[PDB]
Each structure stands twice: as structure tokens, then as C-alpha cells.
Copies of this chain bind each other. A is one copy, B any other.
Amino acid sequence: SDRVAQLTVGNSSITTQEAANIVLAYGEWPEYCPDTDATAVDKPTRPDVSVNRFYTLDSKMWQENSTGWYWKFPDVLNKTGVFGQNAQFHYLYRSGFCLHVQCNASKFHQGALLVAVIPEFVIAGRGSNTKPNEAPHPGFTTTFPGTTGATFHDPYVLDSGVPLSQALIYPHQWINLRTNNCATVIVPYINAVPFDSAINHSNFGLIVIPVSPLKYSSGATTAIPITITIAPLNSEFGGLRQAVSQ
């Protein structure tokens, strides 16, 4: 009565057989901007169907020597569909997200993953140079990976100087291959401003890191992918102008 679930948003539906309870981030549901907290004057648009649905990204094979992956959510589905088209024409943006990460295997595989959101997940440069001219900084595809994603180099320090062990304070969930095969996190709009550009600022980022390695005996299946879907709950847009690319 609890390990089954069907999440339906718009014209999409996600069915599962082995699931834990859904994680609601900070106890707050995604809601529309109230008139007291608002600061713009132009009326915002609310498509409510074409931008509120489960967009499925690509799958990534989880090998034995894998380190992990991360995304930037107001940047991943920024070029795909009506949400991206509506976000390229407008200047202001505000929405929540529903998350779902699929990873199934047999009852003979072992391993565990950690999927969590990190608000304001700034990527750190890797180097030992303090001069301003040679201090290493991450590239644009490292900061904003896009719909593909980026890999970790030192996932022990979250590629940010912050230890992974303390990253359980964020809204997180485990994917233990002996217990479940999916993880679901609902996250509201977390920002210090009511509206913000969905192109020059990623609010938070999803991270999948295998802490327990994938292990199996010789003879079983060897292709274990990680699939992720994203639902932009309660989308709002404002400041209509020409469409920009980036």
C-alpha cells in the first residue's frame, strides 16, 4: 500500500513497484508567488499543462569505476520543449520541481546510490594556484552541463570542498538495490528573490553518487543505467521579450 505509486502530472505518468515514501523538501509544497512577496508589475503567464509534465533525460551506464553525476535543473530542460521555449522568451522565472531517479537491477546485484539536491551548488576549481592569472576555474559545460550532465572528479569532497559525509543535511534519498529501485524528491522554489532568470542562474542541482560500489558475479547483466525524469511544478514566467539562446 506504500511501495507502489503512480505519479501523474499533465500527460505523463510514472508507475513503480519498489519505492519508499516521497521526500518533501523542507516541508514546503511548491506554490504560486503570493502578491505580498511579488515585486514585478506585468502579469505572469501560467501554461499549467505544456510546461508541467515529466521530461525524461538520457540514461547513463553505471560501471564499477563510476564516481557520480550532477545536473543543474533550470538548465537541463532549458532547450527541450515548451518549458524551454517559454523560458527563452521570458526574463523572470519561478517554479518547483518533482524528481524521480530510476535504477533497477536483479536480486543478486549490490550497491547503493545517494540522490540529493543542493541549493546553490557552486562548482569549485581544482588546483593549487593562488595567482589570479593561473587560478583554475570551471568551464561553462562544467558549471552548466546541460541536458547531458557532468561527472565528478573528487566526489569525496563533492567537487566543492565540502565533504560528502555531511551532505545528508540536504533533502536526500538512498537507492539501495536490495530495498528499492527508485527515489522521489519534491522540491519547492528556493531563492532569495521572488523571480529570477532561468538562464544565468541555476537554483539548485541534483547529484547521484554511488557510495557503495556496484558488484555482481560473472554471468549476470552488465548494463546498469541511471534514468532521471523532471516535472516543473507550478511554473511562472514574466518579462516577455525576444528569445535568447544563452
Which residues of A are at the interface with B, using a C-beta cutoff of 8 A? 107, 217, 219
Nearest CB of chain B from residue A107's CB, rounded to whole Å: 7
A107 surroundings in chain B (CB, below 8 A) = 107
Nearest CB of chain B from residue A164's CB, rounded to whole Å: 27
A217 CA / B221 CA spacing, docked (Å): 13
Nearest CB of chain B from residue A223's CB, rounded to whole Å: 18
User: Could you say how many copies of this chain the assembly holds?
Assistant: 2
Nearest CB of chain B from residue A214's CB, rounded to whole Å: 18
A217 surroundings in chain B (CB, below 8 A) = 219
In the complex, the chain B residue whose C-beta lies closest to that of A107 is B107
A173 CA / B237 CA spacing, docked (Å): 51
Q: Which 2 A-B pairs have the closest CB atoms?
A: A217-B219, A107-B107
In the complex, the chain B residue whose C-beta lies closest to that of A220 is B217
Nearest CB of chain B from residue A180's CB, rounded to whole Å: 15
A120 CA / B4 CA spacing, docked (Å): 41
A217 CA / B107 CA spacing, docked (Å): 15
Nearest CB of chain B from residue A199's CB, rounded to whole Å: 47
A129 CA / B225 CA spacing, docked (Å): 55
A217 CA / B106 CA spacing, docked (Å): 15
A-B contact pairs, 2 of them (CB 8 A): A107-B107, A217-B219
A219 surroundings in chain B (CB, below 8 A) = 217
A217 CA / B219 CA spacing, docked (Å): 9
In the complex, the chain B residue whose C-beta lies closest to that of A218 is B219
In the complex, the chain B residue whose C-beta lies closest to that of A219 is B217
A181 CA / B219 CA spacing, docked (Å): 26
A219 CA / B217 CA spacing, docked (Å): 9
A219 CA / B219 CA spacing, docked (Å): 12
A107 CA / B217 CA spacing, docked (Å): 15
Nearest CB of chain B from residue A210's CB, rounded to whole Å: 23
A219 CA / B216 CA spacing, docked (Å): 12
A217 CA / B217 CA spacing, docked (Å): 14
